[PDB]
Amino acid sequence: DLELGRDRGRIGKPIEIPLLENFGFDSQLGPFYLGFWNAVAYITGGIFTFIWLMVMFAQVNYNPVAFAKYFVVLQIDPPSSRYGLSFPPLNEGGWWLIATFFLTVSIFAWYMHIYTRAKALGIKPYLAYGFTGAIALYLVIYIIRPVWMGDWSEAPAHGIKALLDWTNNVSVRYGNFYYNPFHMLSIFFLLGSTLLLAMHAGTIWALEKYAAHEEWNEIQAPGTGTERAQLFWRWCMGFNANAYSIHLWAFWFAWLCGITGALGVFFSMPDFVNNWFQWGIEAGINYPQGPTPPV
Amino acid sequence: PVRTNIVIFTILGFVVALLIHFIVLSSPEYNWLSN
Amino acid sequence: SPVRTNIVIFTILGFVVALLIHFIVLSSPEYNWLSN
Amino acid sequence: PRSPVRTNIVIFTILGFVVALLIHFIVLSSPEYNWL
Amino acid sequence: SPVRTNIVIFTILGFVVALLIHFIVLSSPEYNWLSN
Amino acid sequence: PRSPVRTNIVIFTILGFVVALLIHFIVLSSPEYNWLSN
Amino acid sequence: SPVRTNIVIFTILGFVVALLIHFIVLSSPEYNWLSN
Amino acid sequence: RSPVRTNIVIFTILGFVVALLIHFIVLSSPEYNWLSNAE
Amino acid sequence: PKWRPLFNNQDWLLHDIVVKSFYGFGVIAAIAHLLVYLWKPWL
Amino acid sequence: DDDLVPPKWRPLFNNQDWLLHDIVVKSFYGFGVIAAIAHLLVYLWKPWLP
Amino acid sequence: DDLVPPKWRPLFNNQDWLLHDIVVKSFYGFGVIAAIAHLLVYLWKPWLP
Amino acid sequence: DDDLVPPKWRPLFNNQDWLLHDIVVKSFYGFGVIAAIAHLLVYLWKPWLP
Amino acid sequence: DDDLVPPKWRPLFNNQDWLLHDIVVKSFYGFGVIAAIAHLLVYLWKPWLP
Amino acid sequence: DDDLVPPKWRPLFNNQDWLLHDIVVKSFYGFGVIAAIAHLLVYLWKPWLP
Amino acid sequence: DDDLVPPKWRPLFNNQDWLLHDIVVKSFYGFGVIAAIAHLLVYLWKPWLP
Amino acid sequence: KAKDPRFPDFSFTVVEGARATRVPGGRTIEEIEPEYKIKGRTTFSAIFRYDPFDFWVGPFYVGFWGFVSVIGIIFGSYFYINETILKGPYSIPQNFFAGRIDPPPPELGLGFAAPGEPGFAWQMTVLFATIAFFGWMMRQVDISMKLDMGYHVPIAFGVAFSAWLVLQVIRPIALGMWHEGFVLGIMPHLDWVSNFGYRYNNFFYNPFHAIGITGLFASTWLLACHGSLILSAAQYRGPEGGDIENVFFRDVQYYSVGESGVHRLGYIFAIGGILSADLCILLSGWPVQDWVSFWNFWNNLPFWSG
Amino acid sequence: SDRQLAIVVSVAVGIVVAVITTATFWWVYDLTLGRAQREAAQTAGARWSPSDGIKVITSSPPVTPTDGRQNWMGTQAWNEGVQAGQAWIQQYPNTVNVQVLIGMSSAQIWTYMQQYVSGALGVGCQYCHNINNFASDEYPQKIAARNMLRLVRDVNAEFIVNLPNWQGNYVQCATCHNNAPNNLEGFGAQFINSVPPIKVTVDPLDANGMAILDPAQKPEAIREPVLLKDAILFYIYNYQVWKPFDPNDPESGRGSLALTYDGGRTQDQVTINQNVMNYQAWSLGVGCTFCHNSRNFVAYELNPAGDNVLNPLYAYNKLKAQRMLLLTTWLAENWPRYGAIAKPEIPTGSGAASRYSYQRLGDGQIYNVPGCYTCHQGNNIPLASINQANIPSGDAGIVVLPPQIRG
Amino acid sequence: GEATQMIGPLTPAILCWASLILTVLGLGLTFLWTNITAYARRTRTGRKPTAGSVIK
Ligand code: HEM
Ligand SMILES: CC(C)=CCC/C(C)=C/C=C/C(C)=C/C=C/C(C)=C/C=C/C=C(C)/C=C/C=C(C)/C=C/C1=C(C)CCCC1(C)C
Ligand SMILES: CC(C)=CCC\C(C)=C/C=C\C(C)=C\C=C\C(C)=C\C=C\C=C(C)\C=C\C=C(C)\C=C\C1=C(C)CCCC1(C)C
Ligand SMILES: CC(C)=CCC\C(C)=C/C=C\C(C)=C\C=C\C(C)=C\C=C\C=C(C)\C=C\C=C(C)\C=C\C1=C(C)CCCC1(C)C
Ligand SMILES: [Mn+2]
């Protein structure tokens, strides 16, 4: 909310590409807005990107061809379980710690940037309230669970293939994450969000002819376009949701996925749940296992 | 012309100080919090 | 002059720095007074 | 503004820095030529 | 108006290039200055 | 006198550099020609 | 009628099929002019 | 008019793809391998 | 200019480009298959 | 305008696409000649067809 | 408004024609230097024979 | 209406901003004074430096 | 508005940004000498370079 | 506006852009000649090529 | 709005943008000498090219 | 607004006057519903002149395809309940989670079972569920032509139906056995989804699975951002009415894809990921049986040997 | 029915063309690759016969030994070796120097050796024997063969005949040699080309089941950060069981690779463990559900529920894998005793084996130790292993596999 | 019963059943609320707008 800039924080002049209008997309790349918070976010993100890329590059002994070849499988490891929450020497966890701190600062600065910019323009800051869910998931996974168990070693490594490896490792270590009451709810909300986006986007694209994509003008005054969507869904399944209600559904279905699932990640530790399949056995939802070998 | 350049400057003065402090603290002998 | 904005940003920076310093000092393996 | 030469120049210059970086890194990763 | 945006990109390029070889030199065990 | 000689020219320069890059990299990856492996 | 875009697809198709044929020929153990 | 232009492009794409795949299949065969035979 | 309300003299030229190519395709392909199968035949 | 384009192909073409396609065709035939030379000279090195 | 070749009037103006000329001349400069490099590397170590 | 603001920093400040800034100055300086005692107590309990 | 600022630095400045900006140099330098003293004491504690 | 430009490159270069092309052309040789000297020096250290 | 810039660079830029493009050149020249003196100390410490 | 004359349109038109039918307070269900109840335009009423199915029984449009879907729903649900919840390991409340239906045995191959053999239930349930889903597909097609709309919702539901059809028909047909489907039952189907994919050595290293994961996550992110934008800007009444949304994103994300653009992008985001997931399932087991070592070709590529 | 019938005609035509082109493509596949694939597939899955090694013996260039031995490769050398064996068994019908194969006549020794010791290693008589005097041990290769004959008896009797659901397969001389005398491959191409080059820290399990975190209490090879492949090798050659399999509880049978229990390791060690299990899957040419159920990797199911993606023989395979992990740690422990020639430096060039099959054992010497892929080579049942149903009963079976090394 | 894997004072079966029941109940209630307030409502009190069209 310092906003720097020349003209209300915006530097430069708009750039217009008329080709994008043909496919249905807006033709202007606007003036760039530089504020305090987005400047901090950009600086911290650049530092994090530099640290990540350079620590990966040093592992292949600065070979560009080997860097390109092994870029996906290269990773930065967190501190080992021996150090707990302490600061290890570099190249064995210090690099991970510095990069994680700067990434957290970048995320918080971006949240402040969107909150401030929504307030400045007069609209309500509902984009930041929704970003709070992704922030919660990231915070839990990276800091809160590791700091709670006192091991940095349970946070994901800094690589493209490292995230997939961490997902598989966490699921395997804590017993078949499919038996997670919150990861089940998380899957419900995520798949429901994808389904919701599919139906809503398909409806609006179909009703493009009736100016149903002008949602701002149809919230206050529906018109024939909104009606030929409400009736479509009412005839399809027996209930509909006007322009305002459907966006509430979208926002809530998207946000709840972060919270229900941050809870799932948080509870997956020896203090609360160690075996999720044993949890399901105690819940009686498993198909019965069977006899042990005779021997 | 100069207000932006002051703020940007500053937030660099801060990020670089944080970076050097972390690198100094992570080094084994220079760790003053382990003894 | 953005005196109010600078005041708020300065206080938030102080809070963040104090939190980080407390975390780093308490997590260090010499100063965690959990030996009592 | 009779020609885009004032922006093409920046593209050529950025082409120079990237090629210099790539060649420098390739030579630095050579076991023969490692100077550090 | 004349382009005077080079000054900003050029300062950033200087910072990035200086930070690059201040990291590469650290990675080298012999040229390290932070062990003892 | 309107048609995209410039657009074809700027795409005719990137393609050659990309091809040369790749061509050089393959010959450097061959153990019998790699100069920086003696 | 599109003649200005069917010769862009023509050129890309020819270039891609040349790439593939050279790659396939270079991979054969009897046809390998580099590693021999 | 009705569509005959889509048919022309689809037919060319299908012919090219089938020819490429059939060549690959022929090339993968030990007997018909022509760029790998020694004696 | 064609008693064929489906094409027009334009798009019944384009079409015709495709209708030749096939005739040359058949002859050269038959020659290639004959040459190949004349050197290592099948059943 | 269409003065250069031959009269048969009035529907699709205009003047400049005729020139573009003509240079494309000439490039294609020169390409074919050079490729034929390369294929013949390669066949004398290591035949791939008995 | 162009003094380009009586043939290539429909596509070329002096500005674009001058641009096309430079890259045309540059391509043949590329050619002789690439021929020099290929001939030199062929004498150093033949690959194709 | 900026009689309280001294002529020195008149254009950058008005009455309310100056009033807030005086409070901020006192707060920061007392903050440092308490910091001195805190770091003194810490150093006479667990010296990290020599 | 433009008197305390110079007779050369005038298209680039006015009174308020000249102050607001003159404060920064005094902070900069003063930090700087503090940092020099801190670096001297740290190097006395242990040298990192021969 | 275009005065010092060569007469052939009038449609493309006015004074502003031509005076920039001149310095870029010069620097190319100020980033030329230096690079050749560097390579010559590195060559007689260990030749990469026979 | 310029009356200090050299004659040949007048049409390009004014006093405002060339006054700070003397500050940047003074930074570059001097940034160079500090870099050279710093480099020589390291080259005496351990040569990296023999 | 500046729609690039030298390229094909591909953009909407707004037909004649569907911009002035906007009542400033919203119409009730009473006036809206009779307006667009035209009697005709059905993918049956066009071929066969005059069809019925006691149309509209409440809020719902019955239709011929609705009847087909009702028949399929009744029979498939009967079979699935009768041998998932009725017959299972534990009590009926607990059997909901743990009940299962298993595919036919391998030696059946591609062929029907008998009314009582181990696999008849899977075959009948999948056939009747496919019929019900097809009926729902064509009912959605019918409702769209009722209101003169695009068929994008039927197309996306067809993409989902294509995922289901791949999984339960195409891969079993291509591999020659019905003993390649997936178990029916909420927790048994999770167990199957685990074991399949673990038997291919860490399904995470599937390229098309990664593309589908990206599509899913990006669709959720787009939904969140779009909902937040509309909810925040719904209450704004100022200088720029609808552009208050474009300028806000241009301040945040320096493109601000338009109002129609975001919906088109969401459609592509939702459908492409599921299409890639279909491809991943199709390629899993037929050509390749190991996904970790499938990347063995990456090491031997010409430019990477050292 | 207006002129819009054109689109449906187009659809019908494009469906017909798709049907005919797919049918013709599959006809071409049957005519070229389907035929070629099926002959090649028949070769795979067939057992190993003594003729396989005789063919490579007789169809190889003669070699010139530098250590004072005659050429042992080639049809002529094979012929004269067989003729000299005939002469020797004519001279002495009773053996005079056997120490492991006690109780065999000289004719059965000749017959057993010329098949299952010659084809097994793909070398002629001249490798270890002296043609003129057979019984004399002149070269270290014969001492190695003696000790390695002892290894067959020990390994069979200690691990193989003990296996639950044994199936009947013994280990002969060809099971890990696979018609190759020396420099055998311990890890396949999938392992070397599919394991990422990253550095990891591995925490071994203590005898009670807990982890050892401080480096000073760890085995020597893992006290420093190591590559993933080297940690895989350490786990393979340092495997122990701290919770012996008790059928009465389903959470038993946990060894050095156990993760999900009350004590437990962190998420990091799952990468190393899963890479070890990936190597095991690659060695046998099977998936992860060959022994495990993805719903929980701890169970020993016996009769699993979902059979389409699982192996019905789940628990027996899991227990066999545990026993052979113990076997390929016992081999590392006792390799110097069973006649293995120590290598000075790890061989490099043409003939070497992947650099991972060469290990530095306890007495600071480099050996070529076996691995999981050595005896398997992509098959869950080793194709060079002999089934007891393929062994004739009695006099003829003495030639095939000796009862002395049967266990 | 002694459940080893407890999340606070919550048995596994209670947590699963409560999660399912709460999700279904909430979904039904939100469906009813959304369908009721879709169109403008007409009664003797007044004409309530559709969902949020009177910025109050
Ligand atoms: C690539 C697929 C595989 C995966 C993901 C996998 C995963 C795992 C995991 C997570 C464990 C530790 C589980 C624990 O808590 O008990 C484990 C252990 C084990 N696995 Fe695997 N495994 C795989 C393949 C295999 C295969 C093919 C076999 C059999 C040949 C196998 C045999 C075993 C055995 C015996 C154990 C117990 C080891 C121990 O107790 O020390 N695994 N596996
Ligand atoms: C064995 C033996 C015998 C030896 C071992 C050898 C060894 C290991 C030693 C190595 C030593 C090294 C490498 C020393 C390096 C010192 C450096 C880089 C100092 C930089 C100072 C930079 C300084 C003071 C910069 C000051 C900048 C100022 C005052 C800038 C001011 C300004 C700014 C920023 C904005 C605008 C206004 C203004 C121009 C006034
Ligand atoms: C590798 C294996 C294994 C087999 C082989 C693999 C294979 C697939 C194909 C073989 C070959 C190909 C495709 C060679 C193709 C080469 C080309 C097209 C190069 C670009 C050239 C032109 C060049 C660089 C000249 C360019 C333009 C220049 C120099 C400057 C241009 C201009 C622009 C930018 C505008 C402003 C300034 C100016 C007007 C001067
Ligand atoms: C024994 C009898 C005894 C039968 C046994 C079994 C059998 C022989 C066959 C079964 C099936 C077939 C018929 C396979 C045939 C296949 C295909 C799909 C070919 C590729 C085609 C496309 C061809 C050749 C021509 C293609 C495309 C062109 C010319 C593109 C053209 C055009 C562009 C791009 C747009 C407009 C302009 C232009 C006309 C130039
Ligand atoms: Mn919308």
Q: What does the DSSP assignment read for Q174-241?
A: HHHHSS-SS---SS-HHHHHHS---EE---PBPTTS-B--SGGGS-GGGSS-EEHHHHHHHHHHS--E
Nearest to P142 by CA among P270, P55, P34, P71: P55
In contact, Q278 and A165? CB cutoff 8 Å: no
Residue-range definition of the domain harbouring residue P96: 38-199
Kindly determine whether residue B3 and residue M20, on different chains, have CB atoms separated by under 8 Å: yes
CATH number for the domain that contains residue P259: 1.20.85.10
Rg, chain M, Cα only? 18
How far is it, in rounded angstroms, from Cα A293 to Cα Q250? 10
One-letter amino acid at Q132 equals N
Partners of residue A15 on adjacent β-strands: A29
How far is it, in rounded angstroms, from Cα I32 to Cα P259? 56
Q: Which residue of I has its CA nearest to Q32?
A: I42
Sign of CA dihedral A276, A282, A286, A290: positive
Percent of chain O that is helix, strand, coil (3-state, to 5): 70, 0, 30
3-state SS string over A189-233?
A: HHHHHHHHHHHHHHHHHHHHHHCCCCHHHHHHCCHHHHHHHHHHH
Give residue limits of the domains in chain Q. Answer: 50-167+390-405, 179-383
**Domain end marker among P199, P219, P250:** P199
Nearest to Q325 by CA among Q247, Q246, Q237, Q210: Q237
Helix (H, G, I), strand (E, B) or coil at Q366: strand
Resolution of this entry, Å:
3.0
M17-30 per-residue burial string, b: 16 or more CB within 10 A, e: under 16: bbbbbeeeeeeeee
**Q398: which residues sit within 8 A by CB, 6+ positions away?**
Q104, Q108, Q112
The coordinates were experimentally obtained by cryo-EM
How far is it, in rounded angstroms, from Cα P109 to Cα P177? 4
Whether residue P29 lies inside any domain: the answer is no
* Residue carrying structure tokens 């997590």: C27
Partners of residue P288 on adjacent β-strands: P284
DSSP letters spanning Q239-252: --EEE---TTSTT-
In contact, Q132 and Q146? CB cutoff 8 Å: no
Element holding F21 (H helix, E strand) = helix F5-29
Nearest to P256 by CA among P267, P244, P247: P247
Tell me which residue has its CA closest to atom 13 in ligand 1. Q297
What is the tally of structural domains in chain P?
2
In contact, Q147 and Q338? CB cutoff 8 Å: yes
The dihedral region occupied by Q179, where left means phi > 0, alpha psi between -120 and 50, and beta the remainder, is: left
CA distances from G19 to G22, G32, O50, P298 (A): 5, 15, 44, 17
How far is it, in rounded angstroms, from Cα B7 to Cα O31? 23
* Residue carrying structure tokens 């052939």: N8
* Residue A81 token pair: 């379980």
How far is it, in rounded angstroms, from Cα P60 to Cα P142? 13
Nearest to C7 by CA among M20, L20, A119: L20
**Is O39 marked as a binding-site residue?**
yes
How far is it, in rounded angstroms, from Cα I43 to Cα P2? 66
Q: Which residue of I has its CA nearest to H34?
A: I36
Q: For residue O44, which atom of ligand 2 is closest to its CA?
A: 6
CA distances from Q346 to Q126, Q183, Q351 (A): 26, 11, 12
Sign of CA dihedral A145, A149, A154, A155: positive
Nearest to P280 by CA among P186, P216, P212: P212
One-letter amino acid at R25 equals L
In contact, Q385 and Q170? CB cutoff 8 Å: yes
Partners of residue Q360 on adjacent β-strands: Q366
Give residue limits of the domains in chain N. Answer: 1-50
How far is it, in rounded angstroms, from Cα J36 to Cα J29? 10
How far is it, in rounded angstroms, from Cα R21 to Cα R17? 6
Q322 C-beta neighbours (distance < 10 Å), count: 19
| CA Q228 / ligand 1 centre spacing (Å) | 17
**Domain end marker among A173, A203, A222:** A173
DSSP state of C31: T
* Residue carrying structure tokens 């924080």: A9
Percent of chain R that is helix, strand, coil (3-state, to 5): 45, 5, 50
In contact, P272 and A222? CB cutoff 8 Å: no
In contact, A286 and P187? CB cutoff 8 Å: yes
Q: Do chains E and I touch (3 or more CB pairs under 8 A)?
A: no
Sign of CA dihedral Q65, Q67, Q68, Q69: negative
DSSP letters spanning P247-287: HHHHHHSTT---HHHHHHHHHHHHHHHHHHHHHHHHHBTTT
Partner A, chain D 1-36, Cβ-Cβ below 8 Å: 22, 25-26, 28-29
- Pairing type for strands A15-16 and Q254-255 reads unpaired
In contact, A47 and B19? CB cutoff 8 Å: yes
Around ligand 3, the residues with Cβ closer than 6 Å are: D 8; F 9-10, 12-13, 15-16, 19, 23, 26; G 15, 18-19, 22-23, 26; K 19, 22-23, 26-27, 30
Q3 C-beta neighbours (distance < 10 Å), count: 10
What is the tally of structural domains in chain A?
2
* Residue carrying structure tokens 């087991």: P285
In contact, A28 and A19? CB cutoff 8 Å: no
* Residue carrying structure tokens 């070397």: Q192
Q171 C-beta neighbours (distance < 10 Å), count: 22
Shared-domain flag, residues P215 and P176: no
Kindly determine whether residue F36 and residue N49, on different chains, have CB atoms separated by under 8 Å: no
Helix (H, G, I), strand (E, B) or coil at J19: helix
DSSP state of Q290: G
In contact, J4 and J10? CB cutoff 8 Å: no
Nearest to P25 by CA among R53, Q298, R33, F32: R53
In contact, P142 and P43? CB cutoff 8 Å: yes
In contact, Q203 and Q269? CB cutoff 8 Å: yes
* Residue O8 token pair: 């040949």
> Quick check: CB of I17 below 6 Å from ligand 4?
yes
* Residue P83 token pair: 């041998």
In contact, A136 and A119? CB cutoff 8 Å: no
In contact, Q320 and Q165? CB cutoff 8 Å: yes
**Q102: which residues sit within 8 A by CB, 6+ positions away?**
Q404
DSSP state of D4: T
* Residue carrying structure tokens 């869904």: A233
Q: What is the dihedral of CA A121, A122, A127, A130, to 10 degrees?
A: 150
Q: Which residues of C are annotated as a binding site?
A: 22
P229-268 per-residue burial string, b: 16 or more CB within 10 A, e: under 16: bbbbbbebeeeeeeebbbbbbbbbeeebbbbbbbbbbbbe
Out of C9, C20, C29, the one facing A86 most closely (by C-beta) is C29
How far is it, in rounded angstroms, from Cα P271 to Cα P155? 9
Give residue limits of the domains in chain G. Answer: 1-28
P207 C-beta neighbours (distance < 10 Å), count: 14
Q: Which residue of R has its CA nearest to A268?
A: R7
Phi, psi of A264, deg, nearest 5: -65, -45
Q: For residue M29, which atom of ligand 2 is closest to its CA?
A: 29
Element holding Q367 (H helix, E strand) = strand Q366-368
DSSP state of Q32: I
Whether P8 and chain G come into contact, CB under 8 Å, resolves to no
How far is it, in rounded angstroms, from Cα O9 to Cα N41? 38
Nearest to A44 by CA among A104, A117, A134: A104
In contact, Q357 and Q184? CB cutoff 8 Å: yes
Nearest to Q228 by CA among A59, G22, E30, M6: A59
Nearest to Q122 by CA among Q170, Q171, Q63, Q169: Q63
* Residue K33 token pair: 């230097």
Q407 C-beta neighbours (distance < 10 Å), count: 17
Helix (H, G, I), strand (E, B) or coil at Q154: helix
**P28: which residues sit within 8 A by CB, 6+ positions away?**
R39, R40, R41, R42
Nearest to Q127 by CA among Q199, Q179, Q185: Q179
Out of J11, J20, J46, the one facing G4 most closely (by C-beta) is J20
How far is it, in rounded angstroms, from Cα N32 to Cα A174? 61
Kindly determine whether residue A240 and residue R35, on different chains, have CB atoms separated by under 8 Å: yes
How far is it, in rounded angstroms, from Cα L6 to Cα L17? 12
Sign of CA dihedral A162, A164, A165, A170: positive
> Quick check: CB of I18 below 6 Å from ligand 4?
yes
What's the half-sphere exposure (Cβ side, CA atoms, 13 Å) at A63? 20
Sign of CA dihedral I22, I28, I29, I34: positive
One-letter amino acid at B25 equals L
Q: What is the dihedral of CA I23, I25, I28, I33, to 10 degrees?
A: -120
* Residue A184 token pair: 């089940």
In contact, A281 and Q298? CB cutoff 8 Å: no
CA distances from Q163 to Q155, Q167, Q250, Q321, Q381 (A): 12, 9, 20, 10, 13
* Residue carrying structure tokens 């009356």: O3
Percent of chain C that is helix, strand, coil (3-state, to 5): 70, 0, 30
Q: Which chains touch G (3 or more CB pairs under 8 A)?
A: F, H, J, K, P
Shared-domain flag, residues A40 and A166: yes
The burial class, CB within 10 Å (0-12 / 13-18 / 19+), for A47 is buried
Out of O12, O49, O50, the one facing N16 most closely (by C-beta) is O12
Mutant choice from M14, M21, M28, M41 vs B, greatest count of B C-beta within 10 A: M21
For chain H, the residue count is: 39
CA distances from O10 to B1, D1, E33, O20 (A): 21, 17, 49, 15
| CA A214 / ligand 5 centre spacing (Å) | 8
**Q362: which residues sit within 8 A by CB, 6+ positions away?**
Q333, Q336
In contact, P123 and P178? CB cutoff 8 Å: yes
In contact, A181 and A104? CB cutoff 8 Å: no
Residue-range definition of the domain harbouring residue A135: 35-173
Partners of residue Q366 on adjacent β-strands: Q343, Q360
DSSP letters spanning P207-235: HHHHHHHHHHHHHHHHHHHHHHHHHHHTT
Helices P152-165 and P120-146 cross at an angle (nearest 10°) of 170
Q: What is the dihedral of CA P173, P179, P180, P186, to 10 degrees?
A: 130
